[PDB]
Amino acid sequence: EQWVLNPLKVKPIAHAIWDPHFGQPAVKAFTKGGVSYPVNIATSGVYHWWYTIGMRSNTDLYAGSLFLLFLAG
Amino acid sequence: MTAAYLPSILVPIIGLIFPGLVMAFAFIYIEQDE
Amino acid sequence: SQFIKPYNDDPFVGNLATPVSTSSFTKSLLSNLPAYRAGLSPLLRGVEIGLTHGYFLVGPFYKLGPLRNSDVALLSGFFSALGLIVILVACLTIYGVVSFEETEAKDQLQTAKGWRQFTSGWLVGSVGGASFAYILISNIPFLQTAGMSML
Amino acid sequence: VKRGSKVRILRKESYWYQDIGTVATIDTSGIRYPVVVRFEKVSYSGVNTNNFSLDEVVEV
Amino acid sequence: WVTFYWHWKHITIWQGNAGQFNESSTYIMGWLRDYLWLNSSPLINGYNPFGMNSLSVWSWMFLFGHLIWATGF
Amino acid sequence: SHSVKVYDTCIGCTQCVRACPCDVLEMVSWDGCKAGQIASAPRTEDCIGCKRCETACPTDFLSVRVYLGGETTRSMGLAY
Amino acid sequence: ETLNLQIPSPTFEGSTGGWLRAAEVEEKYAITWTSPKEQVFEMPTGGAAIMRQGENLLYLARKEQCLALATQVKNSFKITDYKVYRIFPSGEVQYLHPKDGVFPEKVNAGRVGVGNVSHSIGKNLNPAQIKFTSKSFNG
Amino acid sequence: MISDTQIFIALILALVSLVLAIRLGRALYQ
Amino acid sequence: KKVSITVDRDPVATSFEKWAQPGHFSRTLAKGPKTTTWIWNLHADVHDFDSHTNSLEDISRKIFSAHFGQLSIIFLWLSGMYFHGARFSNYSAWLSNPTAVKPSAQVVWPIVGQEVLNGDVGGGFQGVQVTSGFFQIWRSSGITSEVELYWCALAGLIMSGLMIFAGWFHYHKAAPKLEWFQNAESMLNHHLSGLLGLGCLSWAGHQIHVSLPVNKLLDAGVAPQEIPLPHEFLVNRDLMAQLYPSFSKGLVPFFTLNWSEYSDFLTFKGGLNPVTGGLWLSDTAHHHLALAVLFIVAGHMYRTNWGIGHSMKEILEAHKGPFTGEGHKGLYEILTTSWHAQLAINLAMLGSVSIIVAHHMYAMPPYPYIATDYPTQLSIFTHHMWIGGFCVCGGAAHAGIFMVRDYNPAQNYNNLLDRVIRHRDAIISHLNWICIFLGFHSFGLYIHNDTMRALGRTQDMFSDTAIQLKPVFAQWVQSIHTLAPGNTTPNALATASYAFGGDVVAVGNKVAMMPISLGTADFMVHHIHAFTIHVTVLILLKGVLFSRNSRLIPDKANLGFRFPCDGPGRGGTCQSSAWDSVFLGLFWMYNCISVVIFHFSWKMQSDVWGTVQSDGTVTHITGGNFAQSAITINGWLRDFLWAQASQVIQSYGSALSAYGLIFLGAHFIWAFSLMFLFSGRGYWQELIESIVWAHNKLNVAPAIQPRALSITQGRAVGLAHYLLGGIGTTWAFFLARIISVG
Ligand code: CLA
Ligand code: CLA
Ligand code: CLA
Ligand code: CLA
Ligand code: CLA
Ligand code: CLA
Ligand code: CLA
Ligand SMILES: CC1=C(C/C=C(\C)CCC[C@H](C)CCC[C@H](C)CCCC(C)C)C(=O)c2ccccc2C1=O
Ligand code: SF4
Ligand code: SF4
Incomplete structure (x- = not known):
């Protein structure tokens, strides 16, 4: 939702990092993306694809995740 | 993050308990004869 | 005078009787050690080996661990030793399940019941030895340091 | 065929299949492969001669 | 060869310096110094004795790939 | 075990049996070739799969043919 | 015929290349031979031993180990008197080599050909033909 | 933003998918 | 007179x-x-x-x-x-x-x-x-x-x-x-006394009569054409006695045993000449004179034609104890009837001596102005490391050829060879364990440091600023060698080498030699060295000990020294020969010597070589980055290979462009080797069959039927191109780097 507001400036987040081997410099170094936790920045382009096909909010990305869990079942 | 507790709860379980348990069971299954 | 001879007076066996392998000192030490001690129950064999191993596991985790510089270094080291004990006791359990067919006799480690008794003793001994190391290091300041308390 | 003639091999798994060798001898007994053909080229095994049947050998 | 070509041609265009590819791609030392050696520097400085940044993970993966590759030998 | 086959192109040269390090092959009477003998494999359980018999075969395509199959302690060459 | 367990063994100072726990729990191989001399040979498992004049007995972990010594004893010392046995942990002694008293390289009556295929190797069936059927590829 | 309840619904549906995955794997294994 | x-x-x-x-x-x-x-x-x-x-x-x-x-x-x-x-x-x-x-x-x-x-x-x-x-x-x-x-x-x-x-x-x-x-006995008497002894004696004589006067005049500042010709020192004993006043007394002090008169030109100074940064040639003259006396004396040990002397057979057969059976009996018969046994020993020794030469020549620079010619120092170290490693692996190659061919069990019953072959499983299993232990505890320290530095945990590393793996024994031996002049070598004036400690020797404002301090990075790279040497020994020894037979192949000696395999059976016996352990150990030799020359190149540039500034500050070539960056693999990649490969990559259009071309060409040859290493002969023979068909179609088939190379030759060609490519890459990289910056 932060990225869709400003897609050329915000760096897309793939998922967060919870790694008990990290030092505090590592935790600070990965805390980009405008959030308060370490993150991987997505290189998959899924933000640009989901933006282009209609998805606007987290609720509809989540609704898509739920629908795919149903389809997987 | 919402449900921020879940990464602390699951990542050690999925990353240590899951392999340990499935390796232990896989070891038992590959070694067993009947 | 020859100090190396064929093993067990059998030349074609794949071993050589040597001073390191077959001295009276080596034979005495192996027999004295709990794993090969005669007259020792498999559970008791496991308790003695476990007490030894759990006792010395705490120290490397405590002194060289991630939380070594913290005041919770001993608790982290004990927990890390305990976690390693639980992983190893799982290894002992799974080895026992696959290796040994179930037999009534339990008087030997190389039996399903005997290895289960050994694993039981090793867990009790290892947790107790790790605990004993924790109690001793906590009480004694010199053990908390690396021997530099005198300095 | 006859001894000394030049022959073309028709055994598909031969090294010298569709190559020319020359017949050394032909047995007269109940032998399964009587035509002994020698070849200028050597096989991968280094052998330069092999026994063949009549229906695997044509005069050239 | 395909992804080295694509990536070098694109990073030179994305700088505004497409002529650097135009002059250096015609010999192999241009590919070695101007693509592999020149662009290695943000990657291999992802950690150093002066700190680390969020490219440290790729800095560790790059060495990890060199190890696996050599272990294959 | 491995499967070892002898084809009727065998000239009875006895070389594959001599090559055999594991006494897998032996000679039996056969009227097909001039030598009066053909190789046989009544002991393919001892066959390690070395394929020394194939190397010794002077036929254009080896009459003796080892086909590596199920592995055992014997066919793996395990002294343990 | 049966292995005389009391046959004396060659003088070997021992080695680490000998047999392991699988010999006493799966199978062991023995080779016996008669030597005219007190002579040094090379063990398949290591260094050098001395075969005694008269009858010798060996314990090896492999049949190839036994047949390697058999070739060394036949090519260097000309012993043709070697018998190779497979001894089970049960105590059963299985005679192996030469299996019917005559070497495999010599023809013998009463030998039945095993593994013999009536056609040449290029007449083997293609794998597609033998697919999803139990029929064998050798015709 | 996603609620903890929404994450729990996703975890319920993934558990149902895990059970169906176990059932397919056992059926394929026979 | 049985020697005739x-x-x-x-x-x-x-x-x-x-x-x-x-x-x-x-x-x-x-x-x-x-x-x-x-x-x-x-x-x-x-x-x-x-x-x-x-x-x-x-x-x-x-x-x-x-x-x-x-x-x-x-x-x-x-x-x-x-x-x-x-x-x-x-x-x-x-x-x-x-x-x-x-x-x-x-x-x-x-x-x-x-x-x-x-x-x-x-x-x-x-x-x-x-x-x-x-x-x-x-x-x-x-x-x-x-x-x-x-x-x-x-x-x-x-x-x-x-x-x-x-x-x-x-x-x-x-x-x-x-x-x-x-x-x-005769050959050893003559090669010790005559070859090495008169070689040193004649060279010491040349040094005293030619090298010493000319180099004193050169270092005094006399121009080369103003220096008297070398025979004018031989005749004009007065002119020679100007430079060295002991020449006024001649050879009377030598024969009367008044040798302390010759201390003008036969010194024990130690250290380096301040003018040239090289060894004092008076020390080198005394060195060669002393070696000549012992080498000539040594060459009188063995018995030839007059009853005095040792029989080497008697020396060997007398050395037997309770652990070793008949002892060294039968080794004299081996070493006078097998050329390969002699070549195995002499190649291992010549390689060891070449390795010793590289360490000693950098540490104690023996020539005038060689220490501050940094391209020469790097070149001759790297060259003699490679000659040493190759010769050591050929020592194991011909140990394997001896074992396969010239070894006779009948003449080697219960001696040292018999006993080594009869416990080769214990030898190879203990060597295997030490190599696993030492790969874990040397390279795994690097992986630990890579991980901790990548994780932001600089306090959790093995480093001088963190957990300190100090080389206390090497530092202590350095202490002893710095304290040795006047204490345990009382007549020495300076240390044997300034690497141990002491002064900084600068020539033309460039460091000739200076103390090489050892820290955590040096502990780590020396245990890398001990690991790579151990594994090369394991492959070469495993090949020598298992050359004749194994539990796998009981009749390996009948297949020969150099065979590809004994088939795909027994699971597969690919590369079971002794030759294939020489083949596999030349890669690990390459690995070992490559890390040694990398350690030398980075350590000398970072901590030894450089320019001496005013106040005696030494600005080193790479500015002391070894200590905090040779502890991680990323540091070796970044601060050594990437940082110093700048000169080869940027050499085009200059005089060092040949090095850039050889850098690329050797990367090519190295990669080209992997075609021979990762592939097998059967692919190439079937491909050649299709090419033979295309020749047959045009009636241009050759009468010498083309074959794919043998399995062994495919291995040998792959190894030869790999060594040429790797060594040529390092050769070009080392030479362009140090010609540009040193
Ligand atoms: C004191 C006598 C003497 C000397 C100097 C040598 C010298 C040599 N021998 Mg030996 N040799 C000797 C006696 C001697 N031998 C005896 C008695 C035997 C019989 C048991 C042998 C048997 C023998 C064998 C079987 C082999 C050698 C080899 C060698 C060469 C080793 C390679 C090397 O470093 O050469 C480089 C060093 C040099 C100095 C090159 C100089 C060459 C000449 C010959 C040296 C002497 C010149 C002359 C005496 C000097 C006059 C000085 C004058 C200017 C005042 C070397 C030339 C090996 C070799 O390479 O064969 C050729 C070899 O295989 N020798
Ligand atoms: C042994 C070490 C060595 C090495 C590596 C070199 C290397 C070199 N020398 Mg030097 N040189 C040497 C010894 C050496 N030289 C000696 C001992 C002398 C004194 C005689 C000289 C005198 C000398 C001079 C005077 C000059 C060189 C020059 C050169 C360069 C080019 C030579 C050339 O292109 O020839 C190529 C010549 C050919 C005829 C082509 C060779 C093609 C044939 C087919 C060779 C094949 C050999 C044959 C097949 C072997 C089998 C025999 C047969 C019976 C089968 C090159 C850097 C030149 C230089 O530096 O210029 C700046 C130069 O002018 N050299
Ligand atoms: C298959 C795709 C996939 C992948 C690669 C990951 C990857 C990850 N997830 Mg999971 N996740 C997924 C789908 C996936 N997720 C789905 C669909 C959901 C909704 C239920 C979640 C819900 C979820 C939670 C709630 C959490 C993670 C977390 C994590 C991270 C740590 C691992 C862990 O604790 O797992 C735990 C994951 C689960 C218990 C859910 C099961 C995941 C999928 C459905 C399993 C599918 C397996 C795959 C298809 C095939 C399996 C066989 C394979 C080995 C060959 C890791 C980045 C943790 C995290 O974010 O830490 C940073 C965490 O706390 N995940
Ligand atoms: C992928 C998931 C994963 C996770 C979540 C962890 C988690 C952790 N690792 Mg890591 N580790 C992993 C994979 C993982 N590991 C792998 C793959 C390797 C090999 C490369 C390592 C190698 C490694 C080393 C070398 C070290 C760690 C350490 C640690 C601890 C962090 C430091 C700390 O706060 O100390 C506090 C830690 C404790 C107080 C220990 C708690 C012990 C647990 C809670 C007991 C668990 C019982 C056990 C799992 C029973 C399982 C039985 C089996 C059937 C599953 C933490 C427990 C450090 C460590 O051990 O800490 C001392 C450490 O030194 N790890
Ligand atoms: C492929 C073989 C090869 C090649 C091309 C070179 C090339 C070179 N060497 Mg090296 N070298 C090699 C093998 C090789 N080396 C081996 C195997 C050894 C060990 C013995 C050495 C030991 C060595 C030394 C000690 C020195 C060289 C030097 C040199 C350079 C000048 C060449 C010269 O005139 O030497 C001339 C050699 C000298 C002037 C000094 C010789 C001193 C040694 C100790 C003489 C010993 C001779 C004796 C016969 C050895 C017998 C072996 C012994 C174990 C019994 C040149 C870079 C010199 C150098 O780097 O200067 C910059 C130098 O000082 N080499
Ligand atoms: C004093 C040293 C010495 C001596 C006398 C020998 C002598 C011998 N060796 Mg030993 N060997 C040595 C050193 C030595 N080697 C070293 C240092 C190694 C380690 C590399 C070996 C490794 C070795 C093996 C592994 C084998 C031998 C074999 C042999 C024998 C025959 C070799 C032959 O015909 O090749 C003829 C020569 C060649 C084919 C030359 C090709 C070699 C390379 C590819 C050429 C190098 C080109 C150049 C240096 C770089 C290329 C430049 C490019 C840009 C143009 C012979 C007994 C073989 C044998 O038959 O055993 C009995 C064998 O199997 N040796
Ligand atoms: C970079 C690539 C690489 C690596 C890592 C290895 C690793 C090894 N080689 Mg190999 N080798 C290689 C390339 C490599 N080789 C190449 C290119 C050749 C070409 C000829 C050979 C040829 C060769 C031979 C011929 C021999 C070896 C031997 C060895 C072993 C040395 C003993 C040792 O250090 O154990 C320590 C293990 C390592 C250093 C591996 C790295 C592990 C690091 C420290 C971290 C461990 C990670 C940890 C397990 C994570 C666990 C969690 C995870 C599982 C989830 C080891 C298994 C020798 C051997 O096996 O006998 C001892 C031997 O004789 N190698
Ligand atoms: C390419 C390749 C071949 C084919 C290579 C061949 C047939 C070599 C022929 C190359 C030409 C015919 C000659 C080579 C000449 C070179 C230009 C320089 C050679 C220098 C020395 C030979 C003098 C194999 O036979 C082989 C076998 C086993 C493992 C790997 C491989 C392998 O990789
Ligand atoms: S080798 Fe080939 S031909 Fe000679 S006997 Fe054995 S099978 Fe028949
Ligand atoms: S493969 Fe080796 S063992 Fe099996 S038959 Fe052919 S030769 Fe005898």
């Missing part, structure tokens, strides 16, 4: 007939080729003399004459180095200004633009900069003229002609009998 000269006269006729029949030397190859494998089999077995002939006499004769041919090639090579120094060099310009002029003895022709390689090396000269250290040798010899370099080139040419004549003469006219070659 015995020769067969006119054994072999000098005819060109066998030249015209390639393959004449073996029964297999003499019937001519039928496949292209014959062509390769010709070169592969040519020098394998004991594969052609049964008799040890003809083998020994072929070896003796081939050694004269090798000596002829070495003398021709030396004569060429002297001629290129005389004719195509700036040696005379370098003599006047050794610290500014760069040595160059190779000039290229202008053909295809390649004349850019004639760079401006200095002294009004253009040529390829040379790094073999010949200029420093010639200045140490006292040559001081290109005319004398022409006379040395002619002396090398005359020696090359005499050695090629002697090889012809001793194979074709007067070839010694086997009983001549089997005189190990």
